[PDB]
């Protein structure tokens, strides 16, 4: 099992500091700085931040788990400047793209030496500081680019975003790939399993690591409830954390007695002077309809309106004269005039950045935004309101999780301006003290990993000689997290000192999990030509590895069965839209033969893959796998590639626009990848075809600039 030694340090109230180090290395604490500071700060740094800096000075990696708005970005700048002082290079991994653009604008303002990498652009890559997403870094770690041998500092933001299922593999794998001679920083939110994370980093790098944790916060919050029609806010918990359910009981009584509302609530808020306000509604139509309802009011002067018109024009002048004449643009601009805004993943990113900036200023007070602001921005406010607790994630129509509740509550509280923040929650259902308590005051949810094996990983790992997947599995978090749950039956056996479990869990204490899936993936890869006996790669593998943006087995089969070799330029774009798009729509479209036929051959290849997967018993289903590929935008993309108008496009489908934009950007990325694949095998007509498709897509707005850039 992983031997590891964890320790605490004697510090003052305000935070807690704890180290994790190899089980056979004694502890000599940090030492003060030597000479000038890398970056002097106007104000005084908390014990939290100064401990982080003292750690970063002595060249030791760190974990920092503290609520947002606690100057958690300071350690990052200190590390960046320290690296640019010693000629080193540094890297800054922000998964989101817009958050990355913001961080780049900031770091460029400050240091003048930075470089951005992202799916859409690339800037000053010869920079001692590289801001970019994480998957880029994954591809680098694979292909050992010219950076890993130069960069000494990594810094992660939103590791808690690793708790997901579809991308929690990236951070883990990236970490496993980094070299022992690296140092880096983790910038998380409140998580109680920090000790396990640190022990993992240590046993994984044989390196010592630090941990900082604190519930500290500069702007304490006050939580209230509103029941339907109660016309009165009832306190539950106070700044001091004193939870008084007396008012909560009264509120529940009002609920029981109850058997154009949020308008009333905002009217209350404004008469109270609680502006500005954030509104978390877990949908899109709700936000838009609330805005329509509340259009009547006005929370701005006329000069502010003129100024918003000025900035709006200076922003949307980068477009054509027609994309301007777009219904969202027009039907929104007055809402912005009036001081209320809306933001959800169904808009044009231009208006999205516009609104984010305006809110940073204050030209809009009430903002209907569902979960975007919750994670990837620093634009706090004075008060926040939860339209409702329920939501949708994955499959379940679950209640709200304390983790997300807190990720949003952290928004309220503007340092300096606001002496405190006002949280409010709307309720329309019986909710006994247990659920309400464990929701409001309950602690965060632990950081569990997903670590689902994937094709791309296996293939890109077959390329290499020094690294194998089994290593990955034995180094992951899903495994290191299965050594504190082991003592259970092991302790039962120690008592027994029944014996079947003894033998088994003794031969399964330091062993591997999730192996069967690995062997089955290998079997598939063999049957389909993506590998061979002796577990070595084959050409199909070196063609698929170039692909990461979609299901690559099926793409390579489509190639090596001769589909794109007979079609036109756009038809290929459409058959790829069949893959990037993953949302459902109301009405499946009607498609012409010339454009549908190919999809039938696609589905036949898919059915073959499904049978070959079922032979190895991957617990997979055929109808789902086959129907996970939505052609609902084939005609959309065809007409777009014919050189048409976005307005002549947003109509054909009862789907929002932002989803189309994501589709098309992923499609262009996939086209670059497929061009490289054809470049690999040896064909040229096909790669020219795909490049021509790309040249057909990018016209006006799907690939516009980021106002933050």
């Amino acid at each position: 099992m992983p031997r590891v030694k964890v320790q605490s340090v004697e510090t003052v109230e305000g935070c807690t500091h704890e180290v994790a180090l190899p089980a056979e290395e004694d502890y000599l604490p940090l030492k003060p700085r030597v000479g000038k500071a890398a970056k002097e700060y106007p104000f005084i740094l908390d014990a939290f931040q100064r401990e982080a800096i003292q750690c970063v000075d002595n060249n030791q990696s760190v974990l920092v788990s503290a609520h947002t708005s606690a100057g958690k970005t300071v350690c990052a700048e200190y590390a960046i400047a320290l690296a640019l002082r010693e000629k080193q290079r540094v890297i800054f991994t922000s998964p989101i793209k817009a958050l990355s653009n913001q961080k780049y604008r900031e770091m460029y303002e400050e240091f003048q030496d930075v470089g951005l990498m992202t799916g859409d652009v690339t800037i000053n890559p010869t920079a001692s500081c590289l801001v970019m997403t994480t998957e880029i870094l994954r591809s680098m770690l694979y292909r050992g680019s010219e950076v890993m041998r130069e960069v000494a500092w990594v810094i992660f933001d939103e590791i808690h975003y690793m708790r997901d299922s579809e991308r929690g593999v990236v951070w883990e794998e990236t970490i496993i790939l980094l070299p022992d001679n690296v140092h880096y920083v983790f910038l998380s939110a409140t998580i109680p399993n920090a000790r396990q994370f640190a022990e993992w980093i240590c046993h994984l790098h044989k390196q010592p690591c630090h941990v900082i944790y604190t519930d500290y916060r500069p702007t304490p919050l006050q939580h209230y409830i509103f029941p339907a029609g109660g016309d009165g806010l009832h306190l539950v918990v106070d700044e001091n954390g004193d939870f008084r359910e007396d008012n909560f009981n009264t509120a529940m009584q009002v609920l029981r007695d109850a058997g154009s509302n949020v308008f009333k609530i905002v009217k209350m808020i404004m008469e109270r002077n609680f502006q500005p306000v954030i509104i978390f509604s877990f949908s899109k139509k709700d936000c838009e309809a609330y805005a329509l309802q509340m259009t009547k009011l006005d929370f701005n002067t006329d000069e502010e309106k003129k100024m918003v018109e000025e900035v709006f024009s200076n922003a949307i002048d980068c477009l054509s004269d027609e994309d301007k004449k777009l219904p969202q643009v027009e039907h929104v601009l007055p809402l912005l005039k009036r001081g209320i805004g809306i933001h959800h993943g169904g808009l044009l990113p231009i208006l999205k950045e516009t609104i984010e900036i305006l809110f940073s200023e204050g030209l809009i007070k009430a903002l209907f935004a569902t979960e975007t602001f919750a994670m990837g921005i620093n634009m706090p406010a004075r008060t926040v309101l939860f339209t409702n607790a329920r939501k949708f994630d994955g499959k379940d129509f679950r209640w709200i999780s304390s983790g997300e509740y807190i990720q949003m509550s952290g928004r309220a509280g503007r340092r300096g301006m606001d002496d405190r923040g006002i949280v409010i929650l709307m309720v329309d259902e019986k909710m006994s003290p247990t659920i309400g308590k464990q929701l409001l005051k309950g602690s965060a949810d632990p950081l569990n990993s997903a670590f689902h094996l994937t094709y791309n990983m296996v293939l890109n790992l077959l390329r290499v000689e020094e690294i194998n997947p089994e290593y990955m599995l034995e180094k992951s978090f899903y495994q290191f997290q299965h050594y504190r749950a082991i003592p259970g039956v092991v302790e039962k056996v120690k008592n027994s000192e029944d014996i079947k479990s003894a033998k088994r869990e003794l031969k399964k204490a330091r062993t591997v999990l999730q192996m069967d899936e690995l062997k089955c993936r290998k079997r598939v890869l063999r049957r389909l030509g993506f590998a061979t006996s002796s577990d070595v790669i084959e050409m199909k593998g070196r063609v698929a590895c170039e692909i990461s943006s979609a299901d690559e087995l099926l793409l390579t089969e489509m190639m090596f069965n001769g589909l794109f070799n007979d079609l036109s330029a756009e038809q290929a774009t459409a058959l790829l839209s069949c893959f990037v798009f993953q949302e459902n729509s109301s009405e499946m479209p009607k498609l012409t033969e010339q454009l549908a036929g190919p999809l039938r051959q696609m589905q036949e290849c898919a059915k073959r893959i499904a049978k070959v997967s079922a032979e190895a018993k991957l617990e997979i289903d055929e109808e789902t796998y086959l129907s996970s590929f939505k052609p609902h935008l084939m005609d959309v993309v065809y007409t777009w590639a014919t050189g048409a108008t976005f307005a002549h496009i947003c109509k054909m489908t009862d789907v929002f626009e932002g989803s189309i934009i994501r589709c098309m950007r992923r499609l262009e990325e996939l086209l670059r990848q497929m061009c490289q694949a054809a470049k690999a095998i040896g064909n040229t007509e096909l790669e020219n075809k795909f490049a021509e498709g790309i040249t057909k897509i990018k016209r006006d707005i799907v690939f516009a600039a980021s106002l933050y850039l």
Partner: protein
């Protein structure tokens, strides 16, 4: 309250859119003949790129422009 914008916003791009010497021998003197190698000062010349009744009307407006 407030009336004007901010700076961090106002920085973005979509918004912004020896010595001397007196030689009595050669103080107030000037060259009387200068060596040139250009046939333009020498002689007047039209604009190279031209066109006759239709080819590339852009060159026709250039002709109208530079030839006067």
């Amino acid at each position: 309250r407030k009336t004007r914008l901010s700076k961090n916003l106002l920085r973005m791009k979509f918004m912004q859119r020896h010595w001397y010497l007196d030689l009595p021998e050669l103080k107030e003197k000037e060259s009387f003949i200068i060596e040139e190698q250009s046939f333009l000062l020498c002689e007047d010349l039209l604009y190279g790129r031209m066109s006759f009744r239709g080819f590339n009307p852009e060159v026709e407006k250039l002709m109208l422009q530079m030839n006067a």
